[PDB]
């Protein structure tokens, strides 16, 4: 309940001119008070129009400002020019930074003046520096300066925080003021004209530095931030890698004194096992070399901190190491040229001097894995393999982006990259030939996208024609079905939907065991991803062809084999100025349907071969092998306790055996912990890097500034949970900057706290960190209803596309492939489903989003005169709130701390009620209807759509299922079985869990079925209304958990809900009309 | 007369009416009021007298 005050103070700060006026708008559910609100708003508008002060009106309508709820603030300012520089000159007292132009290997990566890199405006490109975020550097400077003004007169540790941040911002502000604040355009891009005489990386460096300095609280924070901010001005390439390198060894220096053990996808059983860390001298030499590299780059504080920690190598002081690791990733992205990044990726030294025996065994293992994955569906004539083309057509929405093509629908021309629209266009023009896989050779080389992650090297992505996806979809789906129940495939293994996000490596860690872990992210152009890998897959397909008598399955396998054959001899396109390089590339890359599963298969085969060779010199049992995306790790158990020499010998043997196959591996062997891309374990504890950048983005998103503010808050929450706390006031300042909309060049509307924190499509953040927003008061229900009224919007582009003959022809072909002939009713439902699937196209979704935002803005400019009987979640909670009695309770701490970087209050919740055991899926995946849908298409209807559908008539449900692509017989079986009667409860559970973010943020870490938690909830059971009991119990759990989060203490809840109230609420529980913005989903794991 | 509300509640409690089930017991509550009781009393005595 602080956002509105901070907003008003920020408006005063940024519009300190004497002509600046803030007009606060209010709303109320009470008609008597709403009339006063309307009169107050009218009088404020009239006074501003006549230019009269509004102070007296705050006395005339002091009840409105008291009893009504603030809806927004209208700001009128007329002196906006050169305001940020006027504020900044105060903080530019320090010495500006001078870039070292001999730090980066590539010339254009040195932070020199833009003219020195792009002599003419035609040569200029901001792609190598673009923050790719819809917020300006001027806004970041304004937010930092507002924070400094607000906290200028703090005392105690607050004053120390202010002083540290003032020093860091003095650095940043002096550097920026030396050249002047560059001005963004409407697209938040920085043009050549405003960047000629500035350092090229000034804007992105300034954004990263502002984030870092606003993330500083302690002295160690200040030292790390100062070092990184000063060094990243000159270093743009190797700084993050330099700082993150030691961690891969540090995890191996901490003994385990008790640890966690994964059971099923989030369930941990805890061990009191003690394991000593066995570290050979070579590892210490490597760590010494890493620290020497740090110092050679100008680092003094970070290596000194690491050396100080190395005195004891204790897990209690390891949080500083985790802090350095997380901070390393906030020096921004490395958006080097596609040519250099690709050439780094496809830098290969292929040799004929490889071990033929090893390669033949590896190929045989790949063949065996493919056969194991696809034997049963191939032998039994699985429907998906019989209708592979139809399955691919139905699942096109889940395909990767193609290369942009000029499509025409009706009389409109578009430039979609969506493969479904490409299929539509080709069908309309007689170019749809699934049976032919286009070559990807020097005649039609593959265009390349890029995936960039801070610290990590850039990855190339194939952009293939849609025929590859059509050919590969069904086979890869069968592969994923197999891999979901295979524990070795960490990326895919899951009992229902959730992955082993904590990993499974600590179960077999012992004093007779060692864990070998290897980074394999650089094995895209390795010699083992060449002909051997593709030919192993081809041999598997050839074997599978003999196991089936269905011509359609054989044709599916033939098309998959043809895709592999074509990809064996493939070329890639890379632009370079005015010349396109066609580079031979017969290796693996993402952007193909099978890439993830195929990489897992190949890595498993390769590690099996390597371990087979390593068994020559040592006797051990391989306990587990896990291939988790960019990393692999295997646990080897020995008949003796592990010694230093054993660890060193195993590491050397693994490296040499991988080299025998021409694979360059840095084989890291430990006894106590590992470090992989998505987590690292040290001292029996698990850590996740908190490197999500806030003021910089990898690439320009297809969202709005509103949704980007929501994503900014979500990223801030995820970073905070992982141990990287940015000041919440700075985040709220950014939120108010990004959610404001210009009614005119002089008038700007700032939404209030209620607007932004309310559960709706417009939700951006929560008033309290880690607590889902809900409220039982009349105003909150009223505004939720009003916002729900604005959710439904149309798209003109979607309408024109759906009305075009191209879309109608596509729907007709889809229907005839679905065994319907001029049905006239089924076809219309299929057309609706395909029009919905068109929502993945960025212009359509953006048009809908902007329509919603515009409607919201029109509503916000006036007091909300909207009333409806529509039921929202706040209505349910208001109904059930009065019957809950609250008492003070106590829970002892009886659960282990396994995530040391969790915030203290979240950690308290975990210690008191425990961590999540098993997760109820948020999409209703384990409902009969959802399983039926997944049987034919990977398209996932939103849980809201399923919630609406499951309460319709039987024929309506049947028609919806047929539209999704389920055959009529199966849909009629589902409906006539009356299975929807049981399915509606699972659907309601998933719907409510989605609305209340039970599977997001900190809630995903909690156990909502904890015996300790349910010991605090006392709801006498009344049967035969499961929906009401479910919502009552979930609400009680949320209330208790949120109270503990906010206060750090516990409350018991008691609700003797009357039966009549239960029956009344039962009717409403199936008519809930509520939404929550997906942009507010804070996924702790990513 | 016994309170019509109290007697109706007692009859509902004795009959154990189930919302999800169609029952004959529900119709037992038809036309239970004090005016009907007085109507019956007067009708019986007056008809016997006349």
């Amino acid at each position: 309940g602080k956002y509105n005050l901070i907003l008003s103070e920020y408006l005063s700060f940024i519009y300190n001119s004497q002509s600046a006026v803030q007009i606060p708008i209010y709303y109320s559910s009470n008609s008597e008070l709403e009339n006063r609100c309307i009169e107050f708003h009218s009088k404020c508008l009239e006074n501003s129009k006549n230019g009269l002060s509004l102070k007296k009106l705050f006395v005339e309508y002091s009840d409105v400002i008291e009893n009504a709820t603030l809806l927004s603030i209208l700001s009128y300012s007329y002196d906006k020019y050169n305001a940020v520089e006027r504020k900044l000159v105060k903080y530019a007292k320090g010495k500006p930074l001078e870039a070292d132009l001999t730090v980066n290997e590539l010339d254009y990566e040195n932070n020199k003046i833009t003219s020195e890199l792009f002599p003419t405006a035609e040569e200029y490109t901001d792609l190598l520096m673009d923050p790719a975020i819809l917020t300006s550097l001027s806004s970041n400077l304004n937010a930092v300066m507002f924070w400094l003004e607000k906290h200028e007169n703090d005392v105690a540790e607050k004053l120390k925080i202010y002083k540290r941040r003032l020093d860091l911002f003095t650095i940043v502000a002096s550097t920026v003021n030396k050249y002047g604040v560059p001005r963004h355009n409407a697209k938040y891009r920085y043009e050549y004209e405003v960047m000629k005489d500035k350092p090229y990386y000034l804007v992105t460096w300034a954004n990263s530095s502002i984030e870092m300095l606003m993330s500083v609280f302690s002295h160690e924070d200040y030292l790390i931030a100062r070092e990184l901010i000063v060094l990243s001005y000159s270093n743009r390439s190797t700084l993050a890698k330099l700082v993150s390198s030691p961690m891969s060894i540090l995890v191996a220096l901490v003994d385990i004194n008790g640890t966690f053990i994964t059971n099923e996808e989030l369930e941990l059983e805890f061990s009191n096992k003690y394991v000593r860390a066995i570290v050979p001298d070579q590892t210490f030499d490597e760590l010494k070399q890493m620290l020497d590299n740090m110092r050679k780059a100008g680092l003094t504080d970070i290596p000194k901190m690491i050396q100080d920690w190395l005195v004891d190598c204790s897990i209690e002081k390891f949080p500083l190491m985790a802090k350095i690791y997380s901070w390393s990733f906030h020096v921004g992205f490395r958006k080097q040229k596609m040519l250099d990044a690709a050439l780094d990726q496809l830098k290969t030294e292929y040799t004929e001097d490889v071990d033929d025996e090893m390669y033949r065994e590896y190929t045989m293992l790949i063949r065996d894995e493919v056969v194991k994955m696809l034997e049963e569906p191939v032998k039994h004539d699985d429907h998906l393999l019989q209708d592979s083309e139809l399955a691919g057509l139905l699942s096109m929405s889940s395909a990767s982006n193609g290369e942009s093509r000029q499509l025409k629908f009706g009389r409109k021309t578009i430039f979609s990259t969506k493969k479904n629209m490409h299929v539509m266009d080709d069908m309309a023009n007689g170019r749809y030939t699934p049976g032919i896989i286009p070559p990807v050779n020097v005649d039609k080389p593959i265009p390349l996208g890029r995936r960039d992650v801070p610290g990590r090297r850039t990855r190339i992505i194939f952009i293939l024609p849609y025929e590859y996806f059509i050919a590969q979809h069904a086979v890869v789906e069968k592969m994923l079905i197999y891999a979901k129940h295979t524990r070795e495939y960490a990326e895919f293994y899951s009992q229902s939907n959730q992955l082993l996000s904590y990993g499974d490596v600590t179960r077999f860690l012992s004093n007779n065991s060692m864990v070998l872990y290897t980074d394999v992210s650089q094995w895209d152009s390795s010699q083992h991803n060449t002909q051997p890998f593709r030919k192993g897959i081809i041999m598997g397909l050839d074997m599978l062809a003999n196991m089936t008598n269905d011509a359609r399955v054989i044709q599916t396998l033939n098309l998959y084999k043809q895709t592999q054959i074509n990809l064996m001899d493939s070329y890639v396109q890379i632009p370079d100025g005015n010349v396109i390089k066609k580079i031979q590339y017969g290796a693996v890359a993402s952007g193909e349907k099978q890439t993830k599963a195929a990489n897992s298969i190949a890595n498993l085969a390769l590690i099996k071969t390597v371990l087979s060779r390593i068994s020559n010199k040592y006797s051990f049992a391989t306990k587990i092998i896990r291939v988790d995306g960019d990393d692999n790790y295997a646990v080897l158990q020995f008949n003796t306790e592990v010694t230093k020499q054993m660890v060193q010998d195993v590491s050397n043997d693994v490296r040499e055996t991988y080299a025998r196959m021409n694979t360059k591996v840095k084989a890291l062997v430990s006894t106590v912990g590992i470090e992989i891309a998505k987590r690292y374990i040290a001292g029996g504890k698990i850590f996740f890097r908190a490197g999500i950048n806030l003021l910089n983005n990898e690439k320009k998103g297809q969202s709005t500034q509103w949704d980007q503010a929501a994503v900014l808050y979500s990223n801030y929450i995820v970073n905070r949970l992982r141990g990287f706390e940015t000041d919440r006031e700075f985040i709220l300042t950014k939120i108010m900057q990004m959610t404001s909309v210009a009614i005119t060049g002089s008038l700007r509307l700032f939404p209030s706290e209620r607007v932004l924190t309310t559960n709706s499509t417009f939700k951006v953040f929560d008033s309290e960190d880690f607590i889902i927003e809900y409220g039982t008061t009349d105003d909150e229900v009223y505004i939720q209803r009003a916002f729900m009224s604005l959710s439904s919007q149309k798209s003109g582009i979607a309408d024109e596309i759906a009305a075009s003959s191209t879309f109608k022809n596509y729907v007709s072909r889809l229907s005839e492939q679905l065994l319907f002939s001029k049905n006239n009713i089924v076809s219309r439902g299929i057309a609706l489903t395909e029009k919905a699937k068109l929502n993945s196209y960025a212009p359509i979704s953006l048009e809908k989003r902007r329509a919603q935002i515009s409607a919201l803005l029109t509503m916000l400019q006036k007091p909300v005169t909207f009333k409806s009987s529509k039921i929202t979640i706040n209505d349910i909670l208001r109904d059930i709130k009065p019957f809950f009695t609250v008492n003070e309770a106590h829970l002892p701490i009886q659960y282990q701390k396994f995530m040391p970087t969790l915030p203290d209050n979240v950690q308290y919740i975990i210690q008191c009620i425990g961590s999540r055991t098993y997760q109820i899926e948020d999409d209703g995946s384990k409902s009969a209807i959802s399983r039926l849908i997944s049987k034919y298409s990977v398209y996932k209807p939103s849980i809201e759509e399923l919630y609406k559908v499951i309460s319709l008539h039987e024929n309506e449900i049947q028609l919806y299922l047929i539209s999704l692509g389920i055959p009529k017989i199966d849909a009629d079986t589902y409906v006539g079985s009356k299975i929807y009667s049981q399915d509606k409860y699972r659907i309601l559970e998933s719907y409510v869990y989605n609305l209340l973010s039970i599977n997001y943020g900190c809630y995903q870490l909690f156990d909502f079925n904890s015996p300790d938690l349910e010991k605090l909830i006392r709801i006498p059971f009344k049967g035969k209304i499961p929906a009401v009991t479910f919502i009552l119990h979930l609400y009680a759990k949320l209330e208790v958990i949120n109270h503990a989060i906010k206060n750090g203490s516990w409350i018991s809840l008691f609700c003797n809900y009357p039966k009549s109230e239960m029956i009344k609420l039962w009717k409403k529980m199936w008519n809930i009309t509520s939404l929550r913005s997906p942009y507010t989903n804070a996924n702790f794991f990513q | 007369l016994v309170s019509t509300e109290a007697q109706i509640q007692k009859m509902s409690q004795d009959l154990q009416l189930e919302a999800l089930t169609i029952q004959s017991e529900t119709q037992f509550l038809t036309g239970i009021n004090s005016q009907a009781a007085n109507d019956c009393f007067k009708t019986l005595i007056a008809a016997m007298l006349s």
């Binding site: 309460s951 319709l952 008539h953 | 529900t26 119709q27 509550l29 038809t30 036309g31």
Partner: peptide, 15 residues
Amino acid sequence: TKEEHQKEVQYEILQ
């Protein structure tokens, strides 16, 4: 709506 359609029936439980 389905419940709304069912309301259209002219049955009263107690006559």
